[PDB]
From a paper:
VHPOs are categorized according to the most electronegative halide they can oxidize, leading to chloroperoxidases (VCPOs), bromoperoxidases (VBPOs), and iodoperoxidases (VIPOs). For elucidating the halogen specificity in VHPOs, we chose the vanadium-dependent haloperoxidase AmVHPO from the cyanobacterium [name] MBIC 1101721.
In contrast, in R425S, this section consolidated in a loop structure, strongly influenced by the introduced serine residue (highlighted in blue). The hypothesis that this loop is responsible for the halogen specificity is supported by the crystal structure analyses of the AmVHPO mutant [name], which has no chlorination activity and lacks a structured conformation of residues 400–405. In the [name] mutant, this motif is only partially present (residue 390–400), so no interactions with 7 can occur. These molecular findings agree with the wild-type structure, in which residues 390–404 are also flexible. No co-crystal structure of 7 and the [name] or the wild-type enzyme could be obtained.
Residue numbers in the entry:
A (entry chain A), B (entry chain A), C (entry chain A): 3 to 399, 405 to 639
């Protein structure tokens, strides 16, 4: 009977996931490798680990005490609510006995917290009361199982690069450059041969151009070796797989995924909408997705340009001391004359607008919207699927199953990475590295604590990137909000941050956005005819695309020799959101790719388990990011 | 280890669902009860079963041949792709031998199909070629299992009413009235004491008012017994549970769910949006949901008022003969002067606009949007959940898990009902009953084929509802599109239909919308603090609500003694979409309630299975539609 | 072999209990429904939940902070000793930050605690030192399993009434009346036709009589609907089952259990003893149970009449603030002249004496004593049992097995309800509701916090019950112990309490006494010939009973048309103890009945599991409280 078959199919699906090979998780061992001097001993400095939220020394900016970090890990490893509650959080005083846990300055008894914060912004954040202290997010999310999809520890993602490696130097340099090119028009990030390029309507003091940035990444090197230039023999099988080619105007800041290089940087699905329901009142260039009978506006809230945060020591320290600064950024006010709340809201013109998109990005928003656009267009499903082709011939006739599935996959994604972030890699944030660079150039830290970073900064200084960043930060510090801060005239080398709180309160390696992106897009490519050429139009023989205006009032069309595919744009939107974090300065490149590669494994795993529920015995062809496609 | 624990938790969750009591599915036995005369015998007429798509006699309008229906069922029961492909579809010729299967008129060889259709619309539907033949949707969807949630046959929904019963007469009469009140302003559907009521800007010839409609439902009776008036003793335990009170201006067409009666008819979540991100450029009354950084417009496509379909025999017959007429309805063109594509798109003003909303309603659209509004407002989660309250105190801090869960539930919903629709109840559509009424009054059918309907029509004629419907249809037939049809001057009693194809190609009992509604809302009430009073505002002491303008340009505020709750509006939006179908004339009331009651059981079942994955050992309190709340 | 059979019978008994249907636990959802206003938000007030022990605001008397209650639940749900230890207890100060946990005033460092208490009694309780702080009892008792009997979560008891419901209003009104009739003679609680009625020897100022009280319960109504008057149709299947008839002189305060109405209120087993062992020196009217060779005195400690506690705000607040006041009540001193320590100890004359009986009632005391009386009388066992009838004929010949079984059942009882009290219903105590009434009439609470209670108090005021309670309390406050309290001249509406600490430190719904009562009596009815007519005697044709004297020196006989049965008195003693709490004002009526109905299910379950151990293959016939008897 079905009662038996139901219990079995569910039991069989559990055994499938159990029979799948379980890998062993490896890290760069940096955690306990790099050390600093204590009284009659050397201790692990944890400069190359995530330390945001823990007590940071208010003068130095380094991890205040190691015993805090050692307790912090034990709470993750033991998975105990009690152990994690003993870990000190925020500004702290050092213990009188050596090796004991730091004393937390802030508690529940503090209604006014202005005194503890060193930055003017944080001091007057909570309407004058003083900024609140935020804790670590989803610490015990990696220790939760699921009824469908592979387990969190049943899949791993290969180890992250090191400070001494040439690979990282290119990654941090790439992130720095993106911060200086955050106000650039998206039309610049592509080969000028495709169409006429434009400059952002708002004239912003730029310390770096594209042409310069391309030279930096090809020139930057450690021990006379560039990441892009290094031949296969020198690199490991891991590094070989995630190695990129020489940086080009087309492929700069673009993900290594089929169809990313083809067309403009910005995926169509983040711009275009569906044709107006029934009698077409507007075209696809309008930017209204066919959300059934209602619509979805593709315009995003415009963050007031040339406004970066965490540019000086005081601002940076306070954030790394867990100062809650969410929603302190300002946005452009609307124009009464113009319709559709412009400029207050506008089409994604510059990387800033993408950073804002991903700042409050709903988990699957980017990929749900993509599914709606394709459904409204009338895109065919991968022929292998049942109830396709004519209604008359076969007497049978789904969208419902795919729509739920893109959301299903995201959940499984977060739990897989939340283990990798915390339990395995425990990697520092790019902004947290941005600090280390400045600290070395100010000659802070005890003995040879920051000696590991010495090799990194020289390459960044030798390519002349640091010189620009210091000059760029100087102009940002003339702002009244952080001008009062003592370090304003201190030539701060800190990587500029898009959000006042910068990165979230969870480690860098494994990206929440990228893991969800890889899983959600994989599901969409599985169901849809991945190859299907988007019939957006044709103009003067060559096939038509879209990209934003200089003011972002409408979509400027771009004309391509070959048409854009569903796969190419699905891979491109996956890259956009994942790299969208890299633009804000919260993830490295390698965070994008390895999370994405893990993302599809979680997704694939679900489809293989859900395959037993269907008695049709069909096949689904899923195109992979690493070349060929897998039959399910 | 986890590898073992992972396999077990999944195996344990399967046993939980298997240990749950499995009910036995019962129907009204109407299927093979009502009979008609053949040569030297009586055969099952199947007048009280879903027959849409099968061959209907082109002169009579009845089921052409029973052998077609008997084959149709066998394909569902056997669950064989081959058997279901032999069932004849669309216009057909009768066999020369008696008891053999009908010969299908249309095939793949027909490029032009204009000749087979009797209605002018269908004849010139496919740009002059002639309307296409659509098949049955999701026939084998009820025969699919899932990794999470209870099985399709592990849960049932009690049997549907009969033609002879007084309960149905009120339900069909309620649906008829809604068709005549489809152009009514939503401000009318509430007690006038709450605020000033308005009339729809567009002046439509109305054959029925609210005041009249309220009398009809209280007056209408079978064997001198009204559905609302009948005492508990007379009714069964099933009928007792789904019994309603005497119809009131407040509770007319409103679902029996806590908070449905309270406030206006239209739920806030189908009107209001979230406050503009960052610096508030607009208010909640704007109707922009906080879809992360972008937004969702709450305005829906306006279907040109006073336009109904399937009003005459020719139009009705062709649809019941599986004529594909999707997207033949016309919509109002935009005004160049006004912003935000008005009136082309507008706020949901009249039931028509709700019918359009649910015509292309994305599965979870109504309930996802509701989740976003609550999340953007900053609504608290049911306190029982982990990582709540202060960040500092507990050192821990989800929306991601609930956002996926509302989508997860919908999928499981469709497979549960798709069994009930096809495998169990196989109930006719309200539009298909609308035909039966007309046929009896035209004196069609062989012998006492429609004798069962005789008792129904008399009550509808005795309350004077039919008289209005005939008068209402007359005006609709003066339209040029169906004026040429012979039955235009024939006093057609057919229930007017909102969509040209009317109902979908799957039986009435068990509602796709309502089953998904019940499941999706149940999930939202579980996570959110169900009681939480919405702080939409306060005006002159009394708490403030919203409802549309007469032209639907903005939101007119309504002032209530007590504030609106999250539960009340979540129950109300659940009712709106489910009843939204009843307005279009595709579902009865009982379809709304029993699907919804089944919906929460599917939802509850998932949460109980997913409970094993968490080692926190918390509790979730879920408020039920039938009074008290269940602890998970 | 037996070694195998022993392991199997035990394994088989475990599977039996596992195969029994497991219900799903539902509550009135009141917990998170009723809300109060905080700064820019609404929070769950928890006015309708058990909050005794938690911090209560010392001016208002309401729950001081919700975050305390939310922590309190999490400790129960998580079942963690650590989490429950963080919950604040007793008088507390509010936190400076909002949403954080309240600071406990008292700790281990306080030797003198007089300062924290607001009531004179509590201040000078611990011999001048100041009352101690008591904690919650048997919080983790509901999370313990057993080797015999069904599991705690394998059985549930249907949900409790609400403040808005008419059912509760009658229940609270019934409890209030009992407090005013607590000094009444037990001869009054019966139809005067049975025999001559007497008044309590001690003349007590009574604000309410029986005749008045009977009118109150029939008159009291919510929305013009009385609990006893309401027809079946209006009520739910749960309410239908626990619905009572119009209150009568016979059935007033008497449980709905076969034989409760028959005879006097007070069960014989709480008065009579066994005939003196060997040569009868005294009769059964003496009140000496045949405890083997020794005896048990049926006389109870006399609490000095007209002495009630928690009559003013200060006394009430301190108790609800967990002030330990156990054993502060005074008892009547003995008379040197009279034998058998009278009046210090006496026969149960007034409900006060029953409240004292159940104040220190040993778990099974009432039901063990009942078993001894029946055994000493020579009552026959239910014929189905082995080794019955003649010794000569059958060559075989138990009391030992039943004597242990009544004690066995009690243990299983407490663990079943302790889940319902804490984990499920979490219902407030009647005394805690008694406060809410007063608070509303003093116009305390923030905004519409107590609006829910508004409907309740009006009915109590409209029947004129409150007027008496205020007048009754005034006289009690003239006592020197609570006269100094500021609220003495404040017209206090608080329900008078029998014990200085009133109710115990565990929620109201599910009664420890009633659950044990239902289980213990069920076991006794199973073994004994339930029907057996007690041969207490015969006087002037009609059969003889007993009830106390006005001074309580002996037993006054009552003469009945039909004789009393074992079942009737076993059901009556079960009711007496359960309602004995209702007299003290610690349980509602519904607490008595639903606990009792759950009690027999726990008991029945044990007998079914223990059935496998016997190879005789006999049957036991158990008479149920809901009509017919079940064969085991």
């Amino acid at each position: 009977t079905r009662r038996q078959q139901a219990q079995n199919i569910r039991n069989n699906a559990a055994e499938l996931a159990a029979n799948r090979p379980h890998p062993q998780h490896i890290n760069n061992k940096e955690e306990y490798e790099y050390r600093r001097p204590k009284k009659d001993g050397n201790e692990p400095s944890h400069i190359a680990n995530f330390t945001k939220g823990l007590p940071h020394d208010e003068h130095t900016g380094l991890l205040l005490n190691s015993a805090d970090y050692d307790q912090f890990v034990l709470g993750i490893q033991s998975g105990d609510t009690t152990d994690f509650a003993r870990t000190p959080l925020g500004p702290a005083e050092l213990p009188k006995v050596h090796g004991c846990l730091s004393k937390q300055k802030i508690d529940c008894d503090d209604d006014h917290r202005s005194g503890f914060w060193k930055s003017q912004i944080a001091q007057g954040a909570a309407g004058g009361d003083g900024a609140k202290l935020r804790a670590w997010e989803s610490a015990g999310a990696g220790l939760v199982f699921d009824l469908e999809g592979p387990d969190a520890q049943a899949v791993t993602m290969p180890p992250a690069p090191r400070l001494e490696s040439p690979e990282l130097t290119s990654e941090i340099a790439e992130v720095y450059s993106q911060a200086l090119l955050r106000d650039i028009h998206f039309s610049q990030l592509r080969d000028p041969g495709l169409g006429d390029q434009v400059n952002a309507c708002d004239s912003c003091p730029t310390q770096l151009s594209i042409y310069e940035a391309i030279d930096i990444l090809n020139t930057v090197q450690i021990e006379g070796q560039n990441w892009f230039s290094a031949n296969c023999c020198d690199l490991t099988d891991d590094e070989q797989a995630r190695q990129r080619p020489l940086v080009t105007r087309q492929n700069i800041f673009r993900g290594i995924a089929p169809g990313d290089d083809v067309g403009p940087y910005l995926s169509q699905f983040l711009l275009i909408g569906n044709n107006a329901l029934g009698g077409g009142v507007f075209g696809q260039e309008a930017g209204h997705i066919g959300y059934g009978a209602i619509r979805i506006d593709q315009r995003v809230r415009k963050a007031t340009p040339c406004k970066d945060f965490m540019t000086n020591f005081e601002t940076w320290l306070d954030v790394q001391n867990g100062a809650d600064l969410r929603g302190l950024e300002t946005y452009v006010d609307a124009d009464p004359g113009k319709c559709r709340e412009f400029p207050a809201y506008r089409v994604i013109t510059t990387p800033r607008d993408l950073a804002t998109y991903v700042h409050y990005d709903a988990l699957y928003e980017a990929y749900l919207n993509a599914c709606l656009i394709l459904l409204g267009m009338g895109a065919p499903f991968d022929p292998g699927i049942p109830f396709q082709k004519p209604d008359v011939e076969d007497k049978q006739q789904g969208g419902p199953q795919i729509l739920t599935l893109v959301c299903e996959a995201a959940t499984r994604g977060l739990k897989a990475v939340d283990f990798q972030k915390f339990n395995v890699h425990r990697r520092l944030r790019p902004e947290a590295l941005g600090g280390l660079v400045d600290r070395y150039k100010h000659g802070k830290g005890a003995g040879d604590e920051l000696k590991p970073v010495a090799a990194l900064v020289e390459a960044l200084e030798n390519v002349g990137l640091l010189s620009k960043v210091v000059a760029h930060n100087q102009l940002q510090n003339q702002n009244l909000d952080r001008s009062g801060d003592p370090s304003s005239a201190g030539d701060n080398y800190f990587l500029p941050m898009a959000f006042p709180e910068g990165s979230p309160m969870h480690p860098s390696y494994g990206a929440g956005h990228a893991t969800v992106a890889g899983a959600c897009v994989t599901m969409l490519k599985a169901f849809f005819d991945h190859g299907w050429q988007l019939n957006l139009g044709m103009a003067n023989g060559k096939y038509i695309s879209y990209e934003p205006n200089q003011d972002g009032s409408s979509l400027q069309q771009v004309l391509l020799d070959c048409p854009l595919t569903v796969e190419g744009e699905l891979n491109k939107i996956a890259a956009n959101i994942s790299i969208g974090r890299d633009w804000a300065g919260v993830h490295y490149f390698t965070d994008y790719i390895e999370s994405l590669r893990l993302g599809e494994k979680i997704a694939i795993g679900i489809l293989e388990e859900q395959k037993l529920t269907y008695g049709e015995n069909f096949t689904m062809t899923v195109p992979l990011y690493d070349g060929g496609s897998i039959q399910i």
